Symmetry: D2
């Protein structure tokens, strides 16, 4: 079996005009040889292109790369992770359906499920999905989907994806997993029983902090076709230039992830043993609840995680006195980022959900990059040891 590094570097497809790099198809439309040839493409008959919203060669190449690492039937790229999330949920849910989702999700996913879905007649319950029994207790005759993020952003709360999949499969619900925090090198939800695996490509997959994008991959040709049908009407698209950049970033994804994983575990162990640090939420630590599920169902760990200082003042002193880490939201970049969930990425999360999520002002989230780990640790150590 060919390694994933080789696969990403040698993706299926013909070269265009013998170009070694795949060209940027910065075009809106494509030409027809004849009215019949154009009519046929519109009926899905024959090979070729029509209009970039329906399909763009550069974007399609990026889609093939993702599909090959997810083990999917097809992938669809989007203008953002949120575009991938919207199109993987609202392409299937309709008025009268029920959604069960994790109670600890990315802030704007909470916003989508909590503000927009109910306006479309979709019933939603945010549930502690780390407990299968609670998922089952929340099930109704009209449940059509379960949506999980694991490890969750930002607390790293782990859900039993396999266990929950069994229930979805027995009851006729789709299982959709946001695997953004771990990347497809380490988490392959289609192997664990998910029907759809999605990512904010803005994070690890692109890895270079210079693109916003999303991707979704489906186990079934029918589901990916439905997703793309939704996309053509809802219109969240990956631009050709952004696709070119995301494919290029993805060329180094396996080696970047290996370094992210190792650096993040070492930073977590350093923080864990430090006097100033109360607790560290990294799913690769033996102290972490759900470490056992995470080590069985994933093949590695992303390097974004959260830790608890003794006070909000202590957290602010740390965050404001770093020279290598950069104070900023987002994650999964080559350089290390740090932020304060309570007042930033999760500050829009309604108060009842934010306390069920366990987000307090003492918490700091760090997204460890690929800098030399000793430099990262020395930067944290000097700030923690300030006068």
């Amino acid at each position: 079996a060919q390694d994933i590094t080789t696969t990403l570097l040698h993706p299926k497809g013909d070269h265009v005009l013998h170009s070694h790099a795949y060209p940027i198809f910065q075009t809106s439309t494509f030409c027809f040889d004849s009215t019949q040839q154009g009519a046929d493409l519109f009926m899905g008959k024959g090979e070729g292109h029509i209009y970039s919203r329906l399909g763009n060669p550069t974007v399609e190449q990026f889609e093939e790369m993702v599909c090959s690492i997810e083990g999917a039937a097809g992938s669809a790229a989007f203008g953002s992770g949120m575009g991938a999330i919207s199109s993987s949920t609202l392409a299937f849910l309709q008025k009268g359906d029920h959604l069960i989702a994790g109670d600890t999700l990315y802030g704007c996913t909470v916003s989508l499920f909590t503000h927009w879905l109910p306006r479309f007649g979709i019933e939603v319950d945010l549930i502690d999905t780390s407990d299968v029994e609670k998922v089952k207790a929340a099930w109704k005759p009209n449940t059509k989907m379960v949506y999980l993020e694991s490890p969750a952003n930002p607390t790293c709360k782990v859900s039993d994806i396999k266990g929950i999949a069994v229930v979805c499969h027995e009851r006729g619900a789709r299982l959709v997993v946001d695997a953004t925090f771990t990347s497809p090198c380490f988490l392959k939800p289609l192997e664990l029983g998910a029907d759809i695996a999605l990512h904010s490509v803005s994070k690890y997959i692109n890895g270079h902090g210079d693109v916003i994008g999303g991707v979704s991959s489906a186990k079934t040709a029918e589901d990916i076709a439905t997703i793309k049908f939704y996309r053509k009407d809802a219109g969240s698209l990956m631009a050709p230039m952004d696709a070119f950049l995301c494919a290029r970033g993805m060329k180094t994804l396996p080696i970047r992830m290996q370094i992210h994983m190792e650096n993040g575990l070492k930073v977590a162990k350093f923080l864990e043993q430090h006097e100033k640090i109360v607790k560290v939420n990294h799913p690769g630590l033996e102290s972490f609840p759900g470490h056992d599920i995470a080590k069985k169902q994933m093949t590695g760990y992303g390097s974004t995680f959260l830790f608890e200082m003794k006070s909000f003042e202590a957290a602010k002193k740390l965050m404001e006195h770093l020279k290598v880490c950069t104070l900023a939201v987002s994650l999964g970049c080559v350089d290390t980022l740090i932020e304060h969930p309570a007042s930033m990425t999760h500050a829009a999360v309604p108060e009842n959900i934010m306390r069920k999520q366990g987000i307090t002002p003492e918490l700091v989230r760090i997204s460890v990059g690929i800098e030399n780990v000793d430099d990262i640790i020395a930067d944290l150590k000097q700030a923690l040891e300030l006068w």
Copy 2:
């Protein structure tokens, strides 16, 4: 005129750069916890994350906003992103939408397949007749949605008239002005609440970008559109915004030529023995010319005309040397298309007949080539 404004948009230069930089970035740095917290609460000036706001995209938004006379503008990944964000940001389960019966194929698909799955009642009706709008009206009607002139038939709706109905009755009016551009059609100026465009067409005009834009009359309505966009996720990429803003620098100048070329081409087709009929809003023969002459200050260059058979239309479309057989419109070069088997193939048969779309119709988008060269191209294809 409009040109000076588009060339000299408000804002500071970034590091004294004459061209506005491409902010190819996802995230932005904070000076402190407080400054970041403040930005998330909408206080102070600055950026957080490109999905919430990118300086390059905002520059393009400001350009459109200035020309629409709006309170604000939002850019998207496509015209469809603009459309679904300008409708589903407001409509919810139990609401009713009245839409023009003739729309772009994918707008039909959105209103016809997706909106009712979300419990929104939709009636497509003939909006060229205001009394028909009044008759479709219900107590739960919250929006009327119009294209005018419509794609592909160029059917004209009375925007000013329908806006009066909407204002009186507590409903938003949303107008897709793609086919005409904000040089010649300003729906907010006619009483509309929202004006939107596929920027992929005239506004960018160089056939190398897909993008959308929507502009709201009120600050609250643009804030709601952007709130939806933040969760729905149809963004204009910074490189595409750089390209759209650049394309828009020649917009007024391209439109003058598109308009004049389109009129001359339509007239040539209208007196040609082989052509049954020409649907161009600027022709005296076209039904709705009087309304369009009054409500618009010019005409786009994309219109439809009728051949005597499918075979005759196939022969025309397939023997052109300058015009390109392709979908889309509003590019600098001339495009030509067959609505029945292409742009509108997926439109349900019943909606198809109601639109009046038959296999004998050909749709053309006249570029800014010398008119005589394009007339000569059509001439040899129609005669030989």
Copy 3:
């Protein structure tokens, strides 16, 4: 005869994967089907590509466009106007050769001819090329080239390209013309007997102020081959993204030029009649020396020209209280630029050559955009009234 607008909008070449817009080939290298195929391509046999420095399809597409408007045998694109100039001269001149150049040139052209060429053993004379007899007098047995800009940057001085070309033809010398200021819409030096016609694409051709690039076009197949051979070793390349932007800009070149021309003429007649202005150097003004040559040899005029204030203080006042016009170097953008040549574009030229050029602290160079000309005139009027 198909019109230039149509020609630029419908360039020769097949589509790539049916794409309407020509793709951006952001690649360094190309794949071969076989050893023999790669080897054949290195020998110039067969069709295809090897490596973007030798040839990039996106760049070649921009090259084709320029070659169509110039009526050339071929065109080469570069990373700047200076790259086109260097490669159009040093590809031919060698130690012991003599070059005759116009006395009024872009500042960096002066620096090239005056600092670099003599280090390479090439003799250079800067002479007043508005008088053909002065070209004849400057001639030597080793003269191999005449290099001209017309109208010259920044004074707009006009040379008789057509007359100078006869002399060059008669005497075995190449005539190279930098037609940056006028664009290939209105000035086609190869039609006037020049051997090479070149531009800073950074100006009108691209026209959107967002790219630096050059292009050179040769009358003969052998000369454009030599230019590209020099380019391969010298390495001033147009990037694929910049070529994409330059072709795109060029799609509107003819309509943009038409407006530049009309606008600049109107601005110049306004300034010529205003009491604060000593003279206006626009080659389209009947008052201008060499207007009659420029009217015969060109089919229109660029919109960059120079005018004279009563003092340096007046110049400074004007340049610093404009609200639409932007204080910046460069020219031929969609929007109006304004510049002080003495201390900016031509600051580095030796006092000696500057004297010869007629450049003084009282001169101001404007590059009129495609704004509503009433807004530009109103901007100027407003500033002149303080």
Copy 4:
């Protein structure tokens, strides 16, 4: 001492509008505040920009990254390696000067030095620079520069940079080193006594096969100024978009080089023990003449190197039956390339110089990528073991 990985991920310079990624300044000109401010900038007084040919902020950020790893006084970026090479030689050499250059150089470098320089009155000798005595024997009163490429493209011939630097320093000659083949992670010629270190950025530094570019770095402020002075008149510029791409590629340069070095050595050892292979020219092999010098003067090895088959026919059969390696010129890309120097990269080199470069139809050059090394070795093995 902060690691190069961290240094490259954290370049000096203010952020622009708080942007985390450095913006692409796709502009030709810049605005002045006043006639004086603009006049001042043209005299080198004050901070700010004028025109992209003279300086562009996105390009300057890439220059500063290169300058930080070379240990230079300044770096200059160009449209191609050839642009860097022209500007690093013709900026200093004038009519009547003498240049000593290696006899085994990149083909177009031979073209520059043997066709163009002599046309400008510059005297040039191509010398075997692996022998310092031969360098000295070729020295003349007017010698002004020694130009070296080590290991040489394509034969990997090693020069003694340190030993040749002594002679340059004693006699008033500039030493210029093309370090393209090794990257600035492993070869820092300014530390060995060179005056100028340059690269085709098209190769390892960018690493992604999608840009052509050059860079040159000088030990002295005066020499970098002269180079840039030459650049503004010769006009070989890095485009803003290409500088954005090269800086982005360079963010992963240290980890890519580590994988390239290891893969390359393992592939060379596989080939060296293989029955079909006569000889392997990898400077990290103990059998390689020059290994001892390469091992002392570099801190690693690039992964492009040459090997000898038993025949031209055997070479062609190998090169045309690979499924992972790609038949193409260029090198230092993330994916593996392969090429026939005798009929491709070096087919334009005069037979005189080809004979002494040691280039024959039996030689194949491979540029080993970052694919899993077992997948690379398996691909070569299956082609070598063909019916």
